[model samples]
Target: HQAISPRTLNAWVKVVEEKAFSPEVIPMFSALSEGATPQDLNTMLNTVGGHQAAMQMLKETINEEAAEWDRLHPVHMREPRGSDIAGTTSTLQEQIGWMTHNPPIPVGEIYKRWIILGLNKIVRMYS
Candidate 1:
């Protein structure tokens, strides 16, 4: 299983620390710095609602993708042939590579939803 890289984690922490979220919202930098799992991060984000909930949903999507990959590539025994070994390695690498390269569409959708939610909240306050 692939873990989140330090660089990415640091960047996320920086954003959380620098950005001005709602007064009721808590910064996630500390939790993230403590090596929180994706699930933990998702749970925390879900508590915030709006864009944060959307982020949580996106994280759930990624978990689903990982589960699907595992389902399709069960760890079964294959004959110890050279070709078989190569094929299995290639397939495994390809799937992982694809997943790494292709992020879920929900990420973009979450941002859109977040923006809409913010706007709606603003309108409601003014109205």
Candidate 2:
């Protein structure tokens, strides 16, 4: 059985609220709230246009508010920036990738990993 912590659940609620996805997507969220597994997610995502739609949503949401998300978790931005040896430049998508891969203390890596793995599974399901 998968265990979702309060923080992760709250963050998801925030995303759903902020994104205001259409009512067609509401059933997906409902399934999620009931502790849906990866397969369940895959099914729902497929109904919405397969993995492409899921990926598009992920990219759009991140691109839209990554900076704000980073600001909300200032410490997360610090470590990667501090360790920048080559002074690398990052686009919004790149920043979101980094943030999702290496989140702040509040957002544990396991949660992020779960999201990545889940999305990958969905992609693979359609691939």
Candidate 3:
């Protein structure tokens, strides 16, 4: 574990610097350099409002546009694909209920949950 934090931090800068990781964190991102070592990267982390801006930028990636797809899903449990939306909505509600708790679950949970069950389960349905 030879200080991997810098690796992740560097990518954060690289990803945000190019992929357009929102403008909030861009304040200190100006003149983003490719300097190596943790000390160099650590400076920018705090230079732009410390770790606050750091996590904020990464949070966007982890969450994506959740608000865009979390809305009315036309839930119906009668037809072929109809039941699928119903199950999807129900799962969101229950899964969210627990997820909404304190120290709330992370956005990363969706990826694992979808990979482990949502995708497999839906494939069976869509099959």
User: TM-score for model 3?
Assistant: 0.21
Which candidate wins on TM-score? 2
TM-score of each: 0.26, 0.29, 0.21
Write candidate 1's Cα lDDT for 1-127 as tens digits. 4444556555554554455243222234443424333333333344443455535444444444444545655655231222122122334434333334434222222222333344334334434
Q: Over 4 Å off in model 2, which ranges?
A: 1-22, 34-54, 76-127
Clashing pairs in 1: none
Candidates arranged by lDDT, highest first:
2, 1, 3
Residues 43-107 of candidate 2: C-alpha lDDT, one tens digit per residue = 33333433356667554433334444445546624443311211123333333344355343322
Distance (Å) between predicted and true CA of 88, model 2? Answer: 19
Error of 1 at 36 (Å): 14
lDDT tens per residue, model 3, 1-127: 1222455557556654554334333332333423222233334343333334434543343233333334433334122121122222234343333345465443223333222232233223323
CA shift at 43, candidate 2, in angstroms?
10
Give model 2 RMSD, 1 decimal: 12.9
Instruction: Report the number of the highest-lDDT candidate.
Output: 2
lDDT of each: 0.38, 0.39, 0.35
